[PDB]
């Protein structure tokens, strides 16, 4: 019995070693691992016979549905299409923004003007919206 316990403990120790070299030393994008709220910093402390972890996490709330577009072009120029970087293009519901579209982060609702910092140029696609007048990011 003692031998069996020792072997399972060795395997368990390897798992702990792996989490210290991923879950603790750096942020991870895998999910599954660590706490279940995306991943943000985690900590570990000594415990009898083992290691004890604590994982800080992010929990979403109060979800709303909004209108969004796959990307934006230019009705005057089919090769001018853009797409958001790490975020989305949403129809505006905010009184500060005169523009019909706005940029948001995906972890939290928060509209902002679309700027070149939040976009990348992409090949055109038929599902992209075409702008009939003014789109400032790029203006041309």
């Amino acid at each position: 019995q003692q031998l069996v316990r020792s072997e399972s403990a060795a395997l368990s120790a390897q798992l702990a070693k792996d989490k210290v070299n991923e879950c603790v030393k750096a942020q991870s994008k895998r999910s599954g691992f660590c706490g279940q709220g995306t991943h943000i910093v985690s900590f570990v402390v000594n415990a009898p016979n083992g290691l004890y972890f604590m994982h800080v996490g992010y929990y979403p709330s109060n979800h709303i549905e909004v209108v969004s577009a796959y990307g934006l072009c230019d009705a005057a120029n089919p090769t001018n299409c853009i797409a958001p970087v790490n975020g989305y293009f949403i129809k505006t519901n905010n009184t500060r923004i005169v523009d019909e579209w706005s940029y948001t982060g995906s972890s939290f609702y928060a509209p902002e003007p679309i700027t070149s910092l939040n976009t990348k140029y992409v090949a055109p696609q038929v599902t992209y919206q075409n702008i009939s007048t003014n789109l400032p990011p790029p203006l041309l």
Partner: antibody, heavy 119, light 111 residues
């Protein structure tokens, strides 16, 4: 308690630019865009332009692209607007208005200024 | 922006009479079913006032008597309790696209 105080009317001579103002009161001035419209007759009105009070972003009626502009003094909580190159055909009643969203994604003109005029 | 028109150019009614206003658009204005139609009220010597929005027949500064109606190119206003202080010019406005133009309007009057 939202208010706009539009500036008084003037009989400005042609070829002179004309400035209009409408300071905010009772709300945070920087959180809502200003809308500007023109009334040449009780049955004839048109949009002139919009100015974000937070980012300074604008759009204008294309007839006025070489004409009128809008500015804001955020420290004074006030909006200003001006029309280049006045002509006798431009005499009109003008109104400041505040942007709102009573319905999702629908621009509403909400509160209106008492009106001013130019001749 | 899409052109708006309205009819009859003026309407005269008895007190407490039901009444309506037609308001055609040159092109359908619905985008994702949003509609973007606003109605406004004005009297001489005064600024326009917001009345209703395409999904709001209550609130938006008015009593439930201002009933919005229609879809696509056709819209209307329906008021069952007209009173003398409801006599005003009325204006459809389209927020779907810039310039955000609006109709010349019609005017209600008590006989």
């Amino acid at each position: 308690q939202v208010q706009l105080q539009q500036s008084g009317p003037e009989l400005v001579r042609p070829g002179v630019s004309v400035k209009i103002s409408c300071k905010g009161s009772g709300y945070t001035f920087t959180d809502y865009a200003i809308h500007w419209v023109k009334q040449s007759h009780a049955k004839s009105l048109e949009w002139i332009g919009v100015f974000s009070t937070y980012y300074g972003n604008t759009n204008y009626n294309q007839k006025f692209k070489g004409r009128a502009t809008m500015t804001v003094d955020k420290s004074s909580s006030t909006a200003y607007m001006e029309l280049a190159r006045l002509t006798s055909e431009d005499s009109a009643i003008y109104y400041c208005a505040r942007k709102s969203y009573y319905v999702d994604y629908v621009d509403a003109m909400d509160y209106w200024g008492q009106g001013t005029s130019v001749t | 922006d899409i052109v708006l028109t309205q009819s009859p150019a003026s309407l005269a009614v008895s007190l407490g009479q039901r009444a309506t206003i037609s308001c055609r658009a040159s092109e359908s204005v619905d985008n994702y079913g949003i509609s973007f139609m606003n109605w406004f009220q004005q009297k001489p010597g005064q600024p326009p006032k917001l009345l209703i929005s395409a999904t709001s027949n209550q609130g938006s500064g008015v009593p439930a008597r201002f009933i919005g109606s229609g879809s696509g190119t056709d819209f209307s206003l329906n008021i069952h309790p007209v009173e003398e202080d409801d006599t005003a010019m009325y204006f459809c406005q389209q927020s779907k696209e810039v310039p955000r133009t609006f109709g010349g309007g019609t005017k209600l009057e008590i006989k």
